[PDB]
Design brief:
This is part of a larger assembly, with nine protein chains of nine kinds. With 87 residues, chain A is α+β, with helices and mostly antiparallel strands. Chain A has helices at residues 57-61, 65-75; strands spanning 15-16, 23-24, 32-39, 45-55. Helices cover 18% and strands 26% of the residues of chain A. In chain A, β3 (32-39) and β4 (45-55) form a beta hairpin. The longest helix of chain A is centred in the last third of the chain and has 11 residues, at 65-75. The radius of gyration of chain A is 17 Å and the shape is extended. Chain A starts with 14 loop residues before the first strand and ends in a 12-residue tail after the last helix. Helices cover 88% and strands 0% of the residues of chain B. Chain B is rod-shaped. In chain C, strands 4, 5, 6, 7 and 8 form a five-stranded antiparallel beta sheet that branches. Chain C has a three-stranded antiparallel beta sheet with strand order 1-3-2, with helices on one face. In chain C, a hairpin with a 6-residue loop joins β2 (49-52) and β3. The two termini of chain C are 28 Å apart. Chain H has one domain. Chain H has helices at residues 11-23, 27-33, 35-38; strands at 50-56, 70-75, 81-85. Chain H has a three-stranded antiparallel beta sheet with strand order 1-2-3, with no helix packed on it. The longest helix of chain H is centred in the first third of the chain and has 13 residues, at 11-23. Classes of the chains: A alpha+beta (87), B mainly alpha (25), C alpha+beta (129), D mainly beta (81), E mainly alpha (121), F alpha+beta (97), G alpha+beta (216), H alpha+beta (96), I alpha/beta (206). Bound molecules: magnesium ion (MG) (15 copies). One magnesium ion is lined by residues 7-9 of chain H. Chain C binds one RNA strand of 164 nucleotides through α1. It is classed as translation. The entry lists the keywords Not5, CCR4-NOT complex. The entry is titled "yeast 80S ribosome in complex with the Not5 subunit of the CCR4-NOT complex". Chain A is 40S ribosomal protein S21-A.
Chain lengths: 87, 25, 129, 81, 121, 97, 216, 96, 206
RNA sequence: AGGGGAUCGAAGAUGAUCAGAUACCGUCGUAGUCUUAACCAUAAACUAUGCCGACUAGGGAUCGGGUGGUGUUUUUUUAAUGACCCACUCGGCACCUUACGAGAAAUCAAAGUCUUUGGGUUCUGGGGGGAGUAUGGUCGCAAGGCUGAAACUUAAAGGAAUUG
């Protein structure tokens, strides 16, 4: 958010969960940020080339973190046939 | 004192008051 | 028994978004539910919802994003005038900048700012933020 | 699971669920066309008859009522219509 | 009672950690090297430590003792845990499989030598 | 406060259970609340078994047992060391030793 | 010296992390108060009260002192610490340390018209510790903090200029009402708003950016 | 549904329920019964004049050992007898 | 995506069904496991070993994404996995914690065994429940060698496997080490196998 | 009010114990305990948790009904049954684990979806005593039940947990 003439306020625009689009708070110490490395044409991972996934403490404690990560990976194409929409 | 025996004592009292009032009534 | 189908729908949506799910099955799918969902979808609080037509009353499958904090109903549907809309919003909205009190006027079901623009009031249905 | 397709559930789950708890409710029962030995005289019988249905040609009881599906007699040839 | 305290036990096991090949199964020699190898204010405490070291050496001579891990012990530990058999245990010696495993691999679309056996309730 | 979720008995869906009498003091106690044990024991108390085996007219003898179902109230069961007071944590242990 | 033992402490001593926004963004667990007094040197503390607690023994009553301290700078950041100790000044010192460890940010906002700087809170927000529930309602400009003295000074150290408060329960329980107000101001950055509806590119952690000037 | 009725035509129920539960109070019941008008010595007034009958040496309650130097006084308007505590030190020598 | 050289080879499938990783748990079934396929008679269920391979190469990508490999932690309180995590630590950076996980290893910064990892890998979440619980305090992802009844709470990458077998745990750790070495480039031959036998990561009674 | 009245057993009587013991323990023993016809309308009548309705975490077991399975056994090897086993389903009495949540806590899958305060509805409470007392009605053969104050008095009573 910001005031009347651009000039952004609200220090610390926070992160949002990649599964529930909920704000990861400044003390949600169960939240994680998975970095999955990219590969290019040789089978080897490139350092510094990641896809990032933020997972919140709620969805992690409830046990659906692996299924959320499965569907996110399959949407981003680095998984093929692990997740099924029609359960 | 125990509430059951307090209730019993006031019931006996109510009976005695009933009879001493029925003396005049 | 089942007295307010709008209340049952909004309670189910609230429980679903609390649990973090992206979908919810609504039963039994009335017109005011359709219009309420249309207002929330126009303001971008849910997403796409689909109406399954069985021959009894219908079901609704809503898609839930992460943007909904609380969709609630106001029971009974109080008669609400033009001063009453601002004192109601001051009572049960989190801020003066976002969130909408939804109210059924004679000019269709709409939110309080559109009711202000059309200059008409009515009965209060619920709220969403 | 918190993300799933409710509009197209799989056939196994919808056949597993109760007949009223499906997406759109519908009967799990069906009809049969039954022949008894003797008279040809095919006759259509419900799955859950509740009556001792016999052929109109002769008293040749085809099914007996039960708590659920009707129990067909031993000499019968049925087709699931 | 003759229960020995943790100072005696800790000094003894430390002596065994860093001086195992030096010391032996005799209290007198263990004492005569313990006074040389450590500074102990008491003859009584030195004798107690030497007696417990001799006891733990007696223990070591019959199987290894938990907590003490000297260089010879750990080097034979790693020399034994780098063991690998000549043939693999997972190498095919003939593989047996169930019907469900067979349809799993046929659904994955892989062909491999398999032997189906019936798995009944 | 409430000490036990089961109120110290086994009554979920009755309202009333006909009582029995304690075998030690004849106290009336509901049948679900009692401390039922089963005393199954040989009749010879395991020290005269050799004497009776050598004094029996028959070989191969079965030497039968006596069976009783003992019903104890809480007070007698505690006083006779049958059950004893357990900690708040291990009060919930349902399994026998 | 400091000689830190933490990846985060080593990074802030090296100077790679120059504000607490990265810490708040990645939810990094802070475990050294020297990080906080390095990155926020201008915060001031204040001890609210010292109540004596007592444990009954066979020989007298062992008494120690419970000190609640609030640290904070007057724009955006507060911390709340509560420590029991045998001596009151040691309780104050360690409560200051705990309050520095428990520093959270505050989402200040506008009651209306977004003209000047953020004077009030963005949304209504509540907190509850024990029976005490403390509510915070955004107030117009010039209203000042309408609150009890303790949580008023807490919000002054937060940097809010004006906020309406409603409390409920045993508000004389000072630790409970202070923790409730702390949770209430912490939930501001838990509330998601239409200005936060937009997506962000998920920035990568400094703990892997600066991984070699970390532990080794 | 949180107990109470919520219907739009249910104001009478709430009114009579509030009336009874208002009678459950202390100040409301006292004000409406008029115990100040009936069962008070002052009759609801703030002050009252009276005629001193005698001087009492009323003991303080426990734990406190003192004599409070009160007086017996008969009110003029009611004729009711009333005990009044003479506040300060030595002021009993003014009210003979 | 992937260049399709990462598909499950028949040799790896022979290894997997040799170690019986496919023979999952009994008819007990946590509902967070759709990796199950074609529930067998004898009350046992069969795992999609293709799905296990996909989750394993995903975990290998995650481990290779770490800059410093010693910031990865292998956890095994299970005797069947102690040798596996030790050889995993030998072949990668991956400092091990085998045996008893002392509490306060991720918290309690004054502990002698105090680690600050960026990723923790456990053998069984039920036996290593202290490690994942402590990881929930300091923002650490978890990879777990799960079964079809394992407590998937606070688990982020669940590799389904028969974690009751001696051979299966060692095979999973072996394949994980091989794949992360292949992604790092220490094993340049993606098609050619590894010189290390999978029996090296196995538990022995002496 | 009739019948029945074997046991046990308010009262009572006795034997002990005790400083006392018209209490606990022992022995007798009346009313009662059982039944018929009428009354009485209470209980820690408890889950100390009102009913109806919707949603919200996992796990297995069990009761009743139903569906399917070339499943097992028995019959007449074999049918149909029945009894089991597996999978599922509806409705129950419940139970186990956790806490997203709630709560003052004990604890709770309801005591959750309640300051982000509204699904429908009934009843009850407003510090403690005095007091469920007095009075007045009304019911009852009676015992008593239902309704039900005030004067006066008091700064605490009380709940859940903590260390002794
Ligand atoms: Mg008690
Ligand atoms: Mg009863
Ligand atoms: Mg208050
Ligand atoms: Mg109405
Ligand atoms: Mg006093
Ligand atoms: Mg007597
Ligand atoms: Mg009653
Ligand atoms: Mg009651
Ligand atoms: Mg309900
Ligand atoms: Mg059944
Ligand atoms: Mg059932
Ligand atoms: Mg039942
Ligand atoms: Mg009151
Ligand atoms: Mg009162
Ligand atoms: Mg108490």
């Amino acid at each position: 958010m910001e005031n009347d003439k651009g000039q952004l306020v609200e220090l610390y625009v926070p992160r949002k969960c990649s599964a529930t689009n909920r704000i990861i708070k400044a003390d949600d110490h169960a939240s994680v940020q998975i970095n999955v490395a990219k590969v290019d044409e040789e089978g080897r991972a490139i350092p510094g080339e990641y896809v990032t996934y933020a997972l919140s403490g709620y969805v992690r404690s409830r046990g659906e973190s692996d299924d959320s990560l499965n569907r996110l990976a399959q949407n981003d194409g680095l998984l093929k046939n692990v997740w099924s929409y029609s359960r | 004192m125990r509430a059951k025996w307090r209730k019993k004592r006031t019931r006996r009292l109510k009976r005695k008051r009933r009879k001493v009032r029925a003396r005049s009534k | 028994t089942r007295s307010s189908v709008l209340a049952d729908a909004l309670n189910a949506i609230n429980n679903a978004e609390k649990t973090g799910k992206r979908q919810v099955l609504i039963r039994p799918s009335s017109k005011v539910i359709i219009k309420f969902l249309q207002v929330m979808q126009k303001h971008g609080y849910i997403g796409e919802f689909e109406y399954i037509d069985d021959h009894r009353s219908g079901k609704i499958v809503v898609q839930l994003n992460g943007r909904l904090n609380k969709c609630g109903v106001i029971s009974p549907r109080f008669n609400v005038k033009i001063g009453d809309i601002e004192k109601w919003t001051a009572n049960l909205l989190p801020a003066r900048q976002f969130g909408y009190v939804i109210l059924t006027t004679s000019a269709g079901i709409m939110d309080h700012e559109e009711a202000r623009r059309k200059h008409v009031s009515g009965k209060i249905l619920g709220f969403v933020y | 699971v918190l993300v799933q397709d409710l509009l197209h559930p799989t056939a196994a789950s919808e056949a597993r669920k109760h007949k009223l708890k499906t997406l759109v409710q519908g009967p799990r029962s069906y009809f049969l066309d039954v022949k008894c030995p003797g008279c040809l005289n095919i006759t259509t019988v419900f799955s859950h008859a509740q009556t001792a249905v016999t052929c109109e040609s002769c008293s040749t009881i085809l099914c007996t009522p039960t708590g659920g599906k009707a129990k067909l007699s031993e000499g019968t040839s049925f087709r699931r219509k | 009672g003759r229960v020995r305290t943790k100072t005696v036990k800790r000094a003894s096991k430390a002596l065994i950690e860093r001086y195992y090949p030096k010391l032996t199964l005799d209290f007198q020699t263990n004492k005569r090297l313990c006074d040389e190898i450590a500074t102990i204010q008491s003859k009584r405490l030195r004798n107690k430590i030497a007696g417990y070291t001799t006891h733990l050496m007696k223990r070591i001579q019959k199987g290894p003792v938990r907590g003490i891990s000297f260089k010879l012990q750990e080097e034979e530990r790693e020399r034994k845990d780098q063991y690998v058999p000549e043939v693999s245990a997972l190498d095919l010696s003939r593989l047996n499989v169930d019907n469900q495993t067979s349809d799993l691999v046929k659904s994955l679309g892989l062909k491999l030598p398999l032997s189906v056996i019936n798995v009944s309730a | 406060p409430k000490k036990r979720a089961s109120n110290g008995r086994n009554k979920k869906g009755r309202g009333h259970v006909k009582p029995v009498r304690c075998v030690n003091c004849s106290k009336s106690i509901p049948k679900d609340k009692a401390i039922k044990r089963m005393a199954i024991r040989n009749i010879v108390e395991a020290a005269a078994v050799r004497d009776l085996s050598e004094a029996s007219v028959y070989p191969e003898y079965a030497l039968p047992k006596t069976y009783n179902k003992l019903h104890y109230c809480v007070s007698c069961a505690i006083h006779a060391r049958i059950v004893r007071v357990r900690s708040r944590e291990d009060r919930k242990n349902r399994a026998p030793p | 010296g400091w000689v830190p033992v933490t990846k985060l402490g080593r990074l802030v001593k090296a100077g790679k992390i120059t504000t607490i926004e990265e810490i708040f963004l990645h939810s990094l667990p802070v475990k050294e108060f020297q990080i906080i007094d390095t990155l926020l040197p201008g915060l001031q503390d204040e001890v609210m009260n010292i109540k004596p607690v007592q444990k009954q023994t066979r020989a007298g009553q062992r008494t120690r002192f419970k000190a609640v301290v609030v640290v904070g700078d007057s724009n955006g950041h507060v911390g709340l610490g509560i420590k029991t100790a045998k001596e009151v000044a040691g309780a104050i010192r360690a409560g200051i340390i705990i309050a520095k460890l428990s520093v959270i940010p505050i989402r200040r906002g506008y009651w209306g018209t977004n003209l000047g700087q953020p004077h009030s809170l963005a949304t209504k927000t509540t907190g509850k510790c024990g029976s005490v529930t403390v509510r915070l309602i955004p107030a117009p400009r010039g209203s000042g903090i309408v609150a009890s003295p303790a949580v008023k000074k807490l919000l002054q150290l937060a940097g809010v200029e004006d906020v309406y408060t409603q409390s409920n329960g045993k508000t004389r329980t000072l630790e409970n009402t202070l923790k409730a107000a702390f949770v209430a101001i912490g939930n501001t950055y838990g509330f998601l708003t239409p200005n936060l509806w937009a997506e962000q590119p998920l920035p990568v952690s400094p703990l892997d950016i600066y991984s070699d000037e970390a532990s080794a | 549904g949180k107990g109470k009725p919520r219907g739009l035509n249910s104001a009478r129920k709430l009114r009579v329920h509030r009336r009874n539960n208002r009678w459950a109070e202390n100040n409301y019941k006292k004000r409406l019964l008029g115990t100040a008008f009936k069962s008070s010595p002052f009759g609801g007034s703030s002050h009252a004049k009276g005629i001193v009958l005698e001087k009492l040496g009323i003991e303080s309650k426990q734990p406190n050992s003192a004599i409070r130097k009160c007086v017996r006084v008969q009110l003029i308007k009611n004729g009711k007898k009333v005990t009044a505590f003479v506040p300060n030190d030595g002021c009993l020598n003014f009210v003979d | 995506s992937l260049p399709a050289t990462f598909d499950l080879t028949p040799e790896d499938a022979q290894l997997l069904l040799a170690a019986n990783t496919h023979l999952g748990a009994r008819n007990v079934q946590v509902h967070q496991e759709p990796y199950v396929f074609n529930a067998r008679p004898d009350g046992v269920h069969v795992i999609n070993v293709g799905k296990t391979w996909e989750k394993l190469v995903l975990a290998a990508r995650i481990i290779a994404a770490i800059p410093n490999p010693e910031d990865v932690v292998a956890i095994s309180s299970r005797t069947f996995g102690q040798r596996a995590v030790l050889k995993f630590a030998a072949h990668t950076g991956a400092t091990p914690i085998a045996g008893r996980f002392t509490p306060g290893s991720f918290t309690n910064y004054i502990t002698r065994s105090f680690k600050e990892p960026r990723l923790v890998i456990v053998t069984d979440p039920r036996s290593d429940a202290q490690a994942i619980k402590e990881a929930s305090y300091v923002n650490i992802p978890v990879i777990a060698l799960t079964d079809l009844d394992s407590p998937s709470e606070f688990v982020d990458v669940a590799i389904p496997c028969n974690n009751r077998g001696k051979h299966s745990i060692g095979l999973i750790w072996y394949l994980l080490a091989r794949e992360v070495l292949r992604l790092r480039g220490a094993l340049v031959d993606r098609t050619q196998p590894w010189s290390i036998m999978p029996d090296l990561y196995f538990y022995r009674d002496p």
